[PDB]
Structure formats: C-alpha cells, structure tokens
Amino acid sequence: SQQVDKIKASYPLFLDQDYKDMLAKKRDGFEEKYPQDKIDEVFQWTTTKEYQELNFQREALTVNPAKACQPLGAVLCALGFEKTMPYVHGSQGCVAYFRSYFNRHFREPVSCVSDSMTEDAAVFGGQQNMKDGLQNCKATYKPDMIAVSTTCMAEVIGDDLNAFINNSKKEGFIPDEFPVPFAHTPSFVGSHVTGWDNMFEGIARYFTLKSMDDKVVGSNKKINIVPGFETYLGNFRVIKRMLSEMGVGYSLLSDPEEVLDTPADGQFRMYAGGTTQEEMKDAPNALNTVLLQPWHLEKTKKFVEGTWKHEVPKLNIPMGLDWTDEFLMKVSEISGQPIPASLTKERGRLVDMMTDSHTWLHGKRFALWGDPDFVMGLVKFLLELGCEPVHILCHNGNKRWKKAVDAILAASPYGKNATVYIGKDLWHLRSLVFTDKPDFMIGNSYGKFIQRDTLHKGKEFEVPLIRIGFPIFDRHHLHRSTTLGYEGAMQILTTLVNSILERLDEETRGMQATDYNHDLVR
Amino acid sequence: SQQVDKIKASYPLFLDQDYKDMLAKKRDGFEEKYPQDKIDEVFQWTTTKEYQELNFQREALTVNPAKACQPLGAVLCALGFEKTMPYVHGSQGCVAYFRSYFNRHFREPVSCVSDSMTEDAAVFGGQQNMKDGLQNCKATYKPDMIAVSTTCMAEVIGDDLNAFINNSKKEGFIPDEFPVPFAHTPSFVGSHVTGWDNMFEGIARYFTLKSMDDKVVGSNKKINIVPGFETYLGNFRVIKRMLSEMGVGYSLLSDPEEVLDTPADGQFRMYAGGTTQEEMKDAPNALNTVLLQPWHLEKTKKFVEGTWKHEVPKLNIPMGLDWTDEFLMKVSEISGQPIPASLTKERGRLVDMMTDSHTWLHGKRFALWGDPDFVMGLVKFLLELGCEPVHILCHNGNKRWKKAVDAILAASPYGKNATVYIGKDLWHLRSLVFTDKPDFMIGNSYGKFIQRDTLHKGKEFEVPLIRIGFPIFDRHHLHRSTTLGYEGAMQILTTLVNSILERLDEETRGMQATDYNHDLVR
Amino acid sequence: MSREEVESLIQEVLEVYPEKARKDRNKHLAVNDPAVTQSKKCIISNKKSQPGLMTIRGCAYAGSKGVVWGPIKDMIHISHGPVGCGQYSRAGRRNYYIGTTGVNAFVTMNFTSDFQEKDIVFGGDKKLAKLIDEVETLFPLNKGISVQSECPIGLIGDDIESVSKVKGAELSKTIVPVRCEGFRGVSQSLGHHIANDAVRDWVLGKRDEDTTFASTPYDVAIIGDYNIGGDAWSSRILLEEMGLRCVAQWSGDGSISEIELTPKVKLNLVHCYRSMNYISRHMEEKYGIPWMEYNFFGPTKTIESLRAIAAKFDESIQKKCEEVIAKYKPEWEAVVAKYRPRLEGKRVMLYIGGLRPRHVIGAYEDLGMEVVGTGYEFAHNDDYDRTMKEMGDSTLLYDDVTGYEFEEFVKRIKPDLIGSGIKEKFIFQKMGIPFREMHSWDYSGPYHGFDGFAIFARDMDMTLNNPCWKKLQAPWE
Amino acid sequence: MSREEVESLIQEVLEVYPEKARKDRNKHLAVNDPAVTQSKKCIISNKKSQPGLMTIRGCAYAGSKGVVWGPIKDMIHISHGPVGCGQYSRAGRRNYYIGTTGVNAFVTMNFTSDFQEKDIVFGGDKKLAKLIDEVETLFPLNKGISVQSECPIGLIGDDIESVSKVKGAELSKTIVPVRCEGFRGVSQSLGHHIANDAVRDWVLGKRDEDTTFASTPYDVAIIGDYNIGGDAWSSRILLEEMGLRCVAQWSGDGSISEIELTPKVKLNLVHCYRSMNYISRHMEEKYGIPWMEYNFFGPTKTIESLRAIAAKFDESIQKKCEEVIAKYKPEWEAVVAKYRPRLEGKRVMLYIGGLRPRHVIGAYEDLGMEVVGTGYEFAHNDDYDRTMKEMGDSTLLYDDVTGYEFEEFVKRIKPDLIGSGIKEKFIFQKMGIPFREMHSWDYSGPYHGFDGFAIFARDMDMTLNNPCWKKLQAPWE
Ligand code: ICS
Ligand code: CLF
Numbered sequence A, B: 001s002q003q004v005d006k007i008k009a010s011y012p013l014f015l016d017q018d019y020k021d022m023l024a025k026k027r028d029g030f031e032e033k034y035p036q037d038k039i040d041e042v043f044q045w046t047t048t049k050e051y052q053e054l055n056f057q058r059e060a061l062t063v064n065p066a067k068a069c070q071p072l073g074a075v076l077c078a079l080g081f082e083k084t085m086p087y088v089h090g091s092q093g094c095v096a097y098f099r100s101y102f103n104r105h106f107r108e109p110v111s112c113v114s115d116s117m118t119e120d121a122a123v124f125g126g127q128q129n130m131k132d133g134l135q136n137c138k139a140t141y142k143p144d145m146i147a148v149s150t151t152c153m154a155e156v157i158g159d160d161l162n163a164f165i166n167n168s169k170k171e172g173f174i175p176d177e178f179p180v181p182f183a184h185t186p187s188f189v190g191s192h193v194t195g196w197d198n199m200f201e202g203i204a205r206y207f208t209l210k211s212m213d214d215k216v217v218g219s220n221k222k223i224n225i226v227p228g229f230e231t232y233l234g235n236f237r238v239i240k241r242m243l244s245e246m247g248v249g250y251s252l253l254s255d256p257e258e259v260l261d262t263p264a265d266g267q268f269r270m271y272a273g274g275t276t277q278e279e280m281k282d283a284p285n286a287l288n289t290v291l292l293q294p295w296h297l298e299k300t301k302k303f304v305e306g307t308w309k310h311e312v313p314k315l316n317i318p319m320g321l322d323w324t325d326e327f328l329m330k331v332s333e334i335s336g337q338p339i340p341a342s343l344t345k346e347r348g349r350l351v352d353m354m355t356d357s358h359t360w361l362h363g364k365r366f367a368l369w370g371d372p373d374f375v376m377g378l379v380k381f382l383l384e385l386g387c388e389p390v391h392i393l394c395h396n397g398n399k400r401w402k403k404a405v406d407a408i409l410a411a412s413p414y415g416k417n418a419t420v421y422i423g424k425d426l427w428h429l430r431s432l433v434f435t436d437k438p439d440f441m442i443g444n445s446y447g448k449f450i451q452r453d454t455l456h457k458g459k460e461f462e463v464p465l466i467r468i469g470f471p472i473f474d475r476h477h478l479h480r481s482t483t484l485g486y487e488g489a490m491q492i493l494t495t496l497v498n499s500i501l502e503r504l505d506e507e508t509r510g511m512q513a514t515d516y517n518h519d520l521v522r
Numbered sequence C, D: 001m002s003r004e005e006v007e008s009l010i011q012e013v014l015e016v017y018p019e020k021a022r023k024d025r026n027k028h029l030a031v032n033d034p035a036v037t038q039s040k041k042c043i044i045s046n047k048k049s050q051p052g053l054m055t056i057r058g059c060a061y062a063g064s065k066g067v068v069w070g071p072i073k074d075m076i077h078i079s080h081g082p083v084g085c086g087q088y089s090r091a092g093r094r095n096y097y098i099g100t101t102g103v104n105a106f107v108t109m110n111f112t113s114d115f116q117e118k119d120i121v122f123g124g125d126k127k128l129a130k131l132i133d134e135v136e137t138l139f140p141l142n143k144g145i146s147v148q149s150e151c152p153i154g155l156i157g158d159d160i161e162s163v164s165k166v167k168g169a170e171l172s173k174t175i176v177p178v179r180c181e182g183f184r185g186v187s188q189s190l191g192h193h194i195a196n197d198a199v200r201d202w203v204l205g206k207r208d209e210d211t212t213f214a215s216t217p218y219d220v221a222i223i224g225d226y227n228i229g230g231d232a233w234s235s236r237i238l239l240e241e242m243g244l245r246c247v248a249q250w251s252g253d254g255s256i257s258e259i260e261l262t263p264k265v266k267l268n269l270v271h272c273y274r275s276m277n278y279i280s281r282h283m284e285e286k287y288g289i290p291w292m293e294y295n296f297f298g299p300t301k302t303i304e305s306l307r308a309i310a311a312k313f314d315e316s317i318q319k320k321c322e323e324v325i326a327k328y329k330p331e332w333e334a335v336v337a338k339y340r341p342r343l344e345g346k347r348v349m350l351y352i353g354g355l356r357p358r359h360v361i362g363a364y365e366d367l368g369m370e371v372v373g374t375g376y377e378f379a380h381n382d383d384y385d386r387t388m389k390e391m392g393d394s395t396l397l398y399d400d401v402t403g404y405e406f407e408e409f410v411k412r413i414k415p416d417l418i419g420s421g422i423k424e425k426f427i428f429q430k431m432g433i434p435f436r437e438m439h440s441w442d443y444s445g446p447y448h449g450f451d452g453f454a455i456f457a458r459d460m461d462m463t464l465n466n467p468c469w470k471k472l473q474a475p476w477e
C-alpha cells in the first residue's frame, strides 16, 4: 500500500507489515532456508582465525577480486587521445561492460566500439570483422584515430592485429594514412592497468618508431608526462596546474580529462580535448618523459628509454608530501625551472594541515587496497601522517612491488605492524579486517559489503569504509577529486580526519551514555 | 585501569565497569537525580507540539542562539587588511573570546589586541587606555594600521572613539599620520555581520571621505568587491579566480584569505596579504563596487553610493546557478569584458552535476540556518536542485530579508512548504525538526546537539546535520571549502548528494533486514 | 509526425552508413502500423550487430549469468574464465533478494576462476575442480553451484560438463555447467536460452519422483520476474491477496528449491516472455502446466492481468480478485489525479532490452503520456508481433539501434522523455532531454503493481519536470 | 641556559616596549630560584594587563560562568546581557558530565537574555523576570538558576539580586545572582572569587538545619576539579578505591545537591587552590572542615597525594591506600617503560592559567622530561610561592605573558614542547615546535590519576615525536 503524499520506494516499502508477512511466508513455505541459528553459527565461523587460514589456503578460487581486465585500461588510454575512438577487437559484451563500468564511475558518456566477433569468427578469425568495423566506425563516428585493443576471445583465437589492420588498409576499407594504433591486451595477463600500459605503448610506437631519425632529445624544451591508468580528473588537472605554475613546458600524453568532463549545454560531444597526434609525434623531442605511475608503465618505460633515448627518472607517484617534493625537484632539475613561491606556500599549507590534524590522525589503523602505485602512495602518505596501514592489499601487485612497499614500511616506525598482500582479493581482506580489525578501510565501493559484514558482527566490530580509488559507484562526483600533489594530499587528509571525527561523533551521540564526549570542539 | 598497548581516552575508558559503577554510586547517593521515567517523560514532552507552542511564545529567553556580537565581525574585517592590527576598545575578555572562536574555526593564529578597560575606566572612560594601547601595540607588533572597534562596555559607557584617537595623536602616543580607522560596534545591536559592516564602513570613510575632490569614477578600470563577513577561504579564492578568468580588474577590499592560511614553515607571520591602503584610497576611482553579501552591507552600500557615487548593482550573493549567472553578467556589463569560455564550461559542468544527481536530490526536505545572505543563497540553490527548504531560520535576519526570501520561495513550487523564521534560535529549530521533521539539517556545529536530541527520540527520528556555515568546530579544514560561484555550487551539491547517499547506506546496512537495498551502484 | 516524415528521417539517418551497413540497418528500422500482425514483413530482429557501430547489446554471459542464474540467491555462480566479465557484472543488476550474503545467499558476490596464461594454455578443468572443493570448504551453506562459462572456456576446449558431473556426484551437490560464452549468439537472448536449457537439464527435473509437497488448486509460479528493485515482491503481494499461492519465483529472490518445486504448480505466470518462454514451453510439454503472459506495469495492465489470471481459477479467486481491485482503486486513482496533470501529453522514446519496450507502454498511457518511439536490443520477431499492437500509428520502431541512429532519431523526434540504459543516460542528459533508466529504475522502484505505479509516476514527474532541464543554456548565449 | 643568560634575554625582550609598559613588564618576569619562599620579592602577579599587548587573560565572566558555575549540570545558567559572551563560551570548556541535555542537565546549552538597545537603555530587570518564568515553563526539571552578569549589567544599574530574590521566593527555586561582569578584576581570578562568594551566599548554606544525611567517618569532597575530559572521575575512582566516600564534586559533573551536601563531609580535597581556596577557607571557618591540596598529575604526585590523604584517616584507609598503590604500580610502570625512552631529556615550556603551570610538572618529570619555563595568566603570589619550589634553577617564570614576549622567549629558549592554550597553539605550531593544549588536553584526556597518566604519556609521545615536525622546511630551501 502507498500513500500518494508519502510514496515509499523499495526501502522502506518492503518493511511494511504485509510485505514482511508475505516474505516470511515465502521463506517458510518454499525456500527451504537454513535455520537462523545455523546461519548465525556459520557467519560467526567466517569471522574467525580458522576461517582465515582456510581462506588464505585458497589456490583456485577468487572471491570478490579487486582488479579488472586489460581492455578496460586500454579503452581508458585510448579515450585519452584527441578525437580517438577506442576499438576493441572481439566480442561486443566486453565493450558493453567496459562502457557501463566507466559510465557508472564517471557518470558521463563513454564511447567505445566493438567489431562484434561471434562464433562464426571462432575458427575463421576476425579479419572481416576488423575490416567492416574499421570502415563502419570511421564512416559513422568520424574519428581522427582508432585505437585497437583486444578481448580475450581474439587473444585466445590468435588474431593478428597488425596483419588485419594492414589488410583493411590494403583493400580500401580505411585510408592508408589513417592512424590505427593497436595493442594486444589479453585479459588473462595482468589487469586493467597492464592494458593501459599496452595501449599507450602501442600508440607511442605507432607514432614514433619509424620517425626517430630526425628526433633530437630536448629540442622542444618540454617534459613528457605519462599519467597511466587514472580515474580522478583532479589528478590530471593538478599535474597540469603544478607544471604551469613552474613555467615548465609539458606534454600530457593520453589526457582524457576533457572528454570525461563534458559540459551539459544541450549538445553531446563524443570527443573533447585529448592528446593530439602532433604531440605524440613530437614526444621524442622532449627533454625527458616522467611516468606518474611507474609500477604499471614498465612496457612504456622500456619503449621510451630504448627508442626515445629518454633518461626516465626513478620517481615514485607524486602522492603525499615527500614524493610530491621529489617529483617537483626532479621536474625542476630536468626543465631548469625553479620551484615557485606558490608551490612552496602550498606545501607549507599542507604541512600546517598535517600539524593541525596529527592528534586525530596518530596511530589510526587502516586496511587499504587498490592499484599498485596508488596503494603505495597512500601507504607513504599514511606513514607521513603517523597512521598505521596494517593491511595493504594489491590484487594486481607483484613481488618487486611488494618488496618496494616493504622497504617503504621498514623505513618508518609506523609500518612495523603492516603486512603487504599481493594476489589476494576482498574476501581475504574481509577475513583480515575480522581477525586483525583496523580502525578504517580505504578502497573502492566494493569495500562497502565488507563494512556491512563487519556491522553484522556488531557495531563494535564495524570497520567504516573511506571511498578512495576506482571504482566508486555509490557516491556522486567523487571522480572529480584529487589524490596527486599537495592538493591531493590536502583532500586525502581532510577526508581521513573528517571520517575519524564523524565516526567519533557517531560513537558518542548516545544521550546520557556516551554523549559526555560529544564535544563541540575537536 | 589502562592497558599500556591499548590506552583508552575518556571514550571508552569511562564505559568500563568500575567507572560505570562509580558513576552509578555518585548518581544514586548524592546527585538527587530525577527518576529516569520522569526524565524520559519530560524529553518526550519537549518533542511535542504543545512544547513547540510554549517555545515559540518566548519573548525574553534565548536558548542556543545562532549569532554572535558585532566586534567579532569587526575583527574579521580588520584582519582583511594589510599589516592591520584589530584593536577592540573595552574589556580583554571579549578579545580572548573572539580570538578563541576564530582559532577554533580556522585552526590558525588570530591577532587582535584589547586596551584592557577595567572598573577604573567604568566611570572615568577609557581615554588613557586608548592612548597606552595604541602606543604599546604600535611599538610591539609594528602594524601599518590599527583598526578600532568596541566592546559593549565601551559602548554603554559612551567612549568617543574619534576624540580618543585624536587625543592619542595630539599628545604623541602615536604619529599623526598613522592610520587608525575606527567603528562603533555595540554588541547589543545587530550581530557579528553588522560589526563587519560597521568596521568596513569606518575604514572606507577613514581612507576616502576627505579625499574625494580628485576622484573620478571609473578611472582605474577596476571593480570593487566587498565580500562581507566571510569564513570560507575558498570564497575569496573563487571570486578572485573568476574575476581573473574574465580579465576583469578588481580590488578585493578586506581580503583576509592570506592571513588565515599562513604556511607552516618554521616561522610565524602575524600579517600576510590583505587589502593595501593604496587600494582603499584608490577605491573611489573604480568603475563600480559590488557587495557580495548585500543584506549585511547596508551601511557600506549607503557610504559607497553617497560618497563614491558608485551605482552599486542590485545583486544577490553569487550562490547557486542563477545568481552566479547574474553576478557574472553584471560584472561583464560593468567591466565591458565578455564571459570567457572557461566560465561557460564550468557552468555546464555544474549543470551536468545537477542532472547527474537530481534523482537523489529531488523532494528532499531541509532545515537550515545561518547568516542572511548565506541562508538565502542556500535556499535559492536548494530550490534550483528541486529540494524543499522547509525550515529556514535566520537569528540575525530582519523583516525585509524575510520578505525577500518569501518572494524567492513563492517563485518556485519547491518553496510551498517552506517557512522563514527571523529572531528564532536553535531551540526553536529543535522544536521545528521534532514537529515537522526534515530529511536533513544544514548549519554550523551547534546543530550537532539537535541531531543528538533527535537520535534520542529514535533512529527513525534522527535528522543528520550537514556542516555548511560558521562556525564549524568539530570538523577539520572545512573553512577551506567554497560556497560561492559554480565551484561552490559543485561543492555544495556534492556534499548534499553524498550526505543523502551516506544516510541511505547507513539505513540499508542491516544484513537480511534492509540490505536488499544496499546497492553497489547509486 | 507523419508516417512519410518518419520514413524520410530513417532514410536520411541511414545515409552516412557504408553500403553494406546501411543495407543491413534498413531492415531493422520501421514505422509502426498496429494493423500488422507479422513483424517479419515490417522489421527484422535477432541478427548480427554491424561491426564498429556502438551497439548497446551485451553477450550471452550477460543473458545467462547476469539475468537468469545470478539472481538465484542460495546458489554460488562461478564466472569461469578471466576476471573481467565477473568483475563488471558484480552487483550491477538490482535483482533484490533476502539473505545473508557471506553465508546463505551469494547474489552480489563475485566468484571467478580468474584465468591466467597457464590456465589458457593448459586448460582449467583441474583448476575448476579445485575451485569447487574450495567453494565447498569456505561456503558450506550453499545449496548449489553454477559454472557460467566466459569466452575463453568455449575456445580452449575445456570440458566443464565432465567436471560438473564428477564433482557433483562426489559432493552430492547440484553443479550446473552453462556454456554461456559471450561469442555465442548475437546478444543476451542466446544467454537466456542457454540458461533456460541448463535449468531444464540440471535443476528442474530434481523432484519428479518426489511427492512430499502438498499442492493446492491455487498454485502458481512467477516466471521471468527478476525482482528489479522489488518488482517480484510487489507482484507477489497482489497475487497472494487474490487467494493464490506463489510456490516459485524465477529468478529474482529465487532459490533452487523454488525452481525444483515449480513443476508442481497449477499455473505459470510468465512476466518476461523473452527470457523464460523456453522453460515455460518445456514445463507445459513435460508436466502439462499451462502458462500465461501477464503485465503488471500500471493500473490498467495490472487490473487486466489480475482478472485474466483469476479467470483461470474458481469463483472464489475471482471474488478475491475483485476485492483486491476495489481495495487498490483509490490508491492508483489518487496517484493518477496527482501526477497525470504534470505528465499529460508528454512524449516518450524507449529503448530497453527485450520485454520492457512494450510492457511499460500502458503505465505511460495511464498518466496521459504517449510513446512515439520504441525499440529492442535483442528481441525476436514474436516480441515485435506483440509490440506492434501496443504502439500507436506512425511511431518509430528500432531493433539493435546504434548509438548514432539513436542520437539522430532523438534529435529529429525531440521526445519529452527517454527511457533507456546507462550507456545512453548521460548522452541524452547532455542533450537536454530528461532521461529515466528503464533497466535499473534509476536505482528506484519497484514499478510493478499499484505500489510500483505510485513509485513510477513519482519518478517520471521528478525527472520530467525537474528544474535542471531549464538551465542548460547560459543566459549570456 | 645560565641564569645570567636568562636575565639578558629578559632585558633584550623588554627593550622594545615603551617605557611605562617595559617598567611594568619587568616586574612580571623572573629567573627561578627554588630556595626563595616569597615570590613577592621575585615576581609580581595579579595586576592589570598593559593595554594593547595581546594578553591571553580572560574576563571575570569567564572565571565565574565558564569555570565555576557552568559545569554544575542540573542548574541553568543565564548569560545576562548581549548574546556574544554566552555564544563564545558555549561548550568551549570540556567539563564532562552525565545527564540529558535538554531535560535535566544543561552544561553545553547557551541560555542568554540577548540584550538589545531597549534593554540597554531601559534596563533588563523585567526581561530577567520574564526570562526566569519562561525558563521555569520550558525546562521544568532544572534544580536551580544562576544569573551570570556580563559587562553591561554592571554599567546600566541593573538590580539582579532583587529580581533573583523575588522570583526565587515566588517559584520556591534557588536563583543565584553573580555580579561577574567582565570589566571587574583583571582576569578570570576575580570571577573565581565572585563565583565562590555566590556559592557561599546562595547555595552552600541550604541544609545547615537539615540533618537527614547520614555521614560516615570517610566523607570527603572534591573541590576545584572541573572534570576536564573526565579528570574528576579518574580522581574519584582512586579516592573511592581507597575506602573514602566522595560526597561532592566541585564543580565538574557537579550537582547543586552535592554543593549543598559538602558542609557535611570530613575532608575537603582541593585540587585547584586558585579557583576554590575562598570556599575552602569559608567551609573550614564555618563548619570546621579541614581542607588539603592534592596533586593527581603523574604517578609520583598521585602516590604522594594518596598517602597524604590516607594519613588523615584511620589505619584501614591507609591499608586500602597501600593496596591501591600496589595495584596500580604495574600499570604506570609499564607506561613509563614504554614512553620515557621516547621523552627523556626533552624540554618543556608551559603557560596555563592558574593551577596547571605548577601542577603538571611532576607528570613531565616522571617521563624524564624537564620544564625550563613556566608562567601564569592570573595566578596570585601564593601560586608562585608554590611554583618556585617545583621549578628548577635558572628556569624562566612569566606572569601575564604577552604574545610577543612568549614568542621571543620560545625563539631564544627553543623548547622541545610547549603547553599552552588555543590562542598560542597555531602560533607555535607554525614555528615548528610541538604544541599540546594544556587547558582542554587537545580534546583528549583525562590526565589525572594513573589512567590519566597513561593518556598523558601517550599524547606527549604522539605530538613530540610526530613526523610532521620534520617536514616544515622544503627540501629545495
Ligand atoms: S530478463 Fe531481459 S535488458 Fe526480460 S536481459 Fe535485460 S530484468 Fe531488460 S527489457 Mo536490462 S528481456 Fe529483464 C531485461 Fe528485459 S537485464 Fe532486465 S532491464 S525483462
Ligand atoms: S563477451 Fe561476455 S563479457 Fe566479454 S569476455 Fe566474453 S563472456 Fe566476458 Fe571478459 S575478461 Fe575482459 S570482459 Fe571480455 S576481455 Fe574477456
């Protein structure tokens, strides 16, 4: 039943008595549900050390992963270029899923095409699919470039992207001068960030491999910036702002910030901004190339050092205080431009914020997960804030990255209780937060269920989630935030301290019970 | 008892059994406490309509006011000027309180002096206090200017600020050319924003009244910006950024953003930035003067229109979408500079955010309070978002402002259930949120207690608080936020929609009870 | 607009396509004529997508794992293959359920074998067996396991049926292998069919020799309702208030025991014909259970369906049906009286997957609203046969519409409202047209029944008459 | 540094003052000598602040309403006058209490008469009477009303004593008028004195003729503990574990009945001598109750105070005292063993109001920490007499220090840690010196007792050894 003036959606419409009775009848009559005592006992068991041991003995089953597949990162990288259509060779279902994922995270239109390979292409290959798709996409959406990645079906079948594109050009499906960079992005290797690396390396080699004779390093007085897989528009904006403040000429290669932030003014723009093909062609002429996320740009780094002959600096992600300082000092050394007073003032303001909030931030225990560079930058910043990142999870991390993070943790007294996990999913992290409970969780929206599980054990065992990372589906416009630079450090500090204070306020709101600590001033 | 490895602060140390027993012994033995049944009955009565009627029949009692006294606003305005010491003639306790209030809101040092008038000055006046204070302050803190306001004691006694300052200059306590603007700021008239108005008008008249002969309107090709009482640094920054983006010459008179955001680099700066005395002297030469918060800048408006002969435009606070548009169009018309594509793109991105979030924002009911201009800007933005500001409270509002807000509400269908309250405090608002429960509250930290009260009635009656306004004491670094312009509208929209989504997540986190609506994607 | 104008617009839209793509897409666009009973002479559907044209369609894995099998709460569904497909479909569909997610229900979890290079090269059958063992160890309260194959499983020669049979016999557990590889078929429709066949072959025939379930003359099952935002519950409350007993729900909030009990019911109430007609026909053939299609979108369709369902039973059910209709008449009448004035005369364009493009038309028409354009991602020609009579004259029909086609049609037609998926939502919000998600209900709902009609009318009013749609043009432009 | 260096530093700091201000401020700075018993020959205190020098001191209203009267929870305190003073002191001090804030406790609320121009011109006595009526109507469970006068009340000739007497007789309620106008006195000290006199004259003598309270030989009252973050509770638990009965608490978490029961106790345990010595002396004179000062800051002072208190009673109390000391020895010993290595040898500079600049020295010395500079806002010369012996040789002493003076002293001395109020916190944080709020405990605590010592040691370690203090200089500078 509904009141016309107080219409109720599913919550709390289904909390009504008639709906509760109907649900109870359904459960008791036909569901053959386990007894509630059995369900409670099994849940309590799942929160235990024995369950954690069984969970960490897993070898073949993955539950709630914290990673995606390569073509997603390839699509993002392709979207980073000007009037470029991402084109995934293989099955259309993957493209539908990529588009839906990015639409939910960014809440904005995402353009990507598939050549719709089906079972008829399972034995014959997808050459005709490639030809027809290139022709149709160019005729219909009029891109300046088509960047080709692969679905797992095409990788397993063994489709030769180079030969297929060359045959498409040779038979007039697309003009021979039309840029069609490609990359093999097998989903069974690496993760989405590996796909970003592969797509970027494919595009960079497409535009520079056969034109290196007239290339002189440092002839355009610019620094190349390769951001990697990035889903915070504020990060692109902050890198550009900090480089412009220093007066440093830069080329941000694969810049999707414009096309992911198109204004709503009565017109839909499929393309907006992005790295131009002239920028990609002139990239070898730069003084150097800086990779913002080195731990998933290894193929790109190999190509840039081996072909462009750029002495790529060993730089961590410019996250937190010290690593932003190192990034700025390296940029100053490469470009010859001193760090301006505005950046020093911004650093001092971040330090003032840290001194203001260190009392509430000290000793707090965090479980966190995400991509390798983001995770290690967050761990470094937490160590700088005096926090304890007890559970550090990276599903797509590797052994060398784990060794680097362990070295970072060993350099700080606040990393003594920290353990790094690679190849572990969010069910492992759920066991970890039940067994060695942290104060907070930091990660994407998939962590919310973990919080629910913790709350089911009791309010005193609940671990609140802080939504930093990718993807965030249950909050609006968080993709506009910043995590890089002093600005990103300030945003992260504000989020952390205010999550702590909001949790404390919730814990002390009980009148005559805990409200003696419900301080107005904190 | 304390564990050395798990030391507990007051919460939850006093939840321990021995502390609970000791507190129960104290209550039962000596407190002569009312029975818990009586306390529960009286609370339930305080949540009722009869209590609301008795509460709104109040004429002489004020409970939990939502305003401060004039010298606080005078101190803020004085801090808005370059190397200027705020100087309050009267009692030192007021200056201690002003400094503590601003220190807690901004988490930054706040400089202000008092001449420490005591009972010896109660009958003799504070002339000697003024002379000694001016001399000592100039000798010790070396300000370029000393801006004098008053405490209520000096106002009641009847101290003549002009005569006292003139006698200080005449007998050599301070140089005759030293700028000492003054303003009478009685704590029993108006509120803190009235004090800001009075201080600004005093400074503007001090610097321009006797030098108007050589002044030509529009000779420096600039627009004057008077911000009013403002406690968000982002608001100053956004006004400056939007004016610089348009290429519009501007003078921000009383700019305290620099001195309220000093970096922490091993040195304390008592002064930083601020409006220069040359800017104040050249202010009559501007094309026009724009008052960001007209409803508490009436004295300043009268002086600027009557002396500077500036045709001050009728502009609302640039809050929300339409009012920011009107502000930008007026600035363009005055300065002759077109609105650039960047501002149009930012407006389109704000409109995109509104379209992205309108489903979760539609029909939501808000009780809100704060200063008049901020409150009416927030009401206008809420009406633009499809929200319902049911309880609009302004303790320091007046009848003309209430009429203006009623006109704004009547122009939108979403203001049909809205009532405006002037001269009402937060106890009135507590009755209102108990009787006609809104979905959310918007206001300063003093609203948190109201939330506690609502939670005491039940989780289903709890009204969560959204901290927008002044002062915010229980969250860190919120004073860096923005509420003006498209940027401020985006920040406010993000805060509102994510508060709604966080509340929904909390309500649907119950496993097997409400978690059927615990959607990953919202 | 006129029929000639619609044909003209179709021809201008098709002009930018290459010759083969244009010739193909001309068969997938039509102008409605309600007097036509066979759509095969008017439109072509259930065909290949033209390559590189931004189709909205999904894969067979989406139609099987994401649509039919995933909602079943007490079963654990393994996305067999690389991590991507399971990760992108995790909790993306709002098929609501009641349960404890780590313990006895597993709808919103992502179980996957997470294939690597070694599994691609050497196969993943041993990995699948070890995974099933670990699933048994760590989730002992699961009542069954389904293995939804992703693309590489169908290409590396993996035999998941043998593993399923061996491990199910060893553990005395139901293990359902589903060859729902994405490259199979042309859309989610073949996924529906494969999942229906899996249900028939591995679950449905479990209690044929069992006769310990007491059957009443008023036993019905709900087939093809996936409880999107609680739609199945809102239908079930009305069905049970009519005196009927809903033994099973397929598959929203559904359990494996309900599926096993379905062959004992007296009537099958098929909501989504597209996804569950196969199993409905199989049950009618094997057990003799009649099935009938019903519509619970809007009060008129709800009342018609309730009367049609009650006409299949005795007079007491008919009396209870009339009582339910009379009880709910004031509620939906008040909803109409409040929201029809704000929605009368406003035009809608729809593009949803396979049932809703024709099923929600009556709910729109009950608020004074007209539908000028509709289309399907993966419908068959029987769906268009049912759609043509529900559409007005000279209205646009599109099958497997491309992105460019849909933007062009919206630009020319200029509807007041568009109901489609998440991949079109922000595209059309940028163009200034109010958009309603017709898959997930924009994270609102339910829309079935009278309570659902109230929610639906409120949502249409809140989006169509939102102030934000009148602020897209800057005042200085 | 040496004594001569300290005198030289004082002289060069004073050089910048004008002649009168310098001559005045020279009397308020001293080099410590623990062998000196009279501070009047070493330092001058409790005097006027020099005008326009940024003193930290507050007003008499702060010392009366904010310090003594406000913590009493079951009473309603009216800030009589303009809205400002009550607004700035609302919930600014962490005097913890247990109660229902709208109903039976009112500590964190702001009750004010909110004076306007009409009330200034024509007086506010009728407004005060109407306000008291409304307070009775809307908060029926209040057990008393105090009227704390702000500045204008003492200047417009308002007679709040007559209104208080008339309305208290009419309503049979305790109404305490407090002439605590801010211009009275030189700091919060006169506010303390006025509030103590109000307690004596209007509340304390309420049950002299009442003999229905059973008195045990171990009855004590806690006087001058304001439960900052729970300090009073942490002291009371130790006192009651000793076998003593704490009848009253003044005034943190205090009730009016506890104040009225204080004249029945056997011992007064005065924590803050400065704020409550007046009432302690009055109770000793009128009721013959001995009072003694005690220190519960740090384990050494706590143990000394517990033994001194138990020495005032029979042998059973002494045995229970030894038992409590033995029970708590491992806890504070573990706290020391964990935190003393991180804090040993580190120097502290303190500037708090009237008790803590000398009371917390032992807690610092118990962690290997030395105090090189201390000072008071509003202490009297007896406070400095007590302070000189607790300070080391050649340590700086400052009374009513100015902002410039304190900043210069910190720049020259360079302490490892500064403990002061919120108005110095960010000043010294920007200079790179770790800062601890010694009024509010930086929203932490309690610091009394052994539990308080654990919290205090953890806080000192967390702030002094914080990494943020090593990042103030940019690496490129
Ligand atoms: S199952 Fe089908 S696409 Fe019948 S695959 Fe799809 S929850 Fe659609 S039009 Mo999403 S044939 Fe259901 C459908 Fe309809 S996922 Fe839902 S809304 S009524
Ligand atoms: S059509 Fe469908 S969703 Fe596509 S793969 Fe095939 S079953 Fe799956 Fe999977 S991991 Fe990523 S998303 Fe693909 S490229 Fe493979």
Ligand code: CLF
Pocket (backbone or CB within 6 Å): B069, B070, B071, B091, B092, B093, B094, B095, B097, B150, B151, B152, B153, B187, B188, D059, D060, D061, D062, D082, D083, D084, D085, D086, D088, D149, D150, D151, D152, D180, D181, D182, D183
């Ligand atoms: S020394 Fe003390 S705090 Fe000062 S006024 Fe006097 S009692 Fe009060 Fe009050 S309203 Fe504002 S803060 Fe003053 S100017 Fe008057």
Ligand SMILES: [Fe+3]
Pocket (backbone or CB within 6 Å): A352, A353, A356, B107, B108, D426
């Ligand atoms: Fe700060």
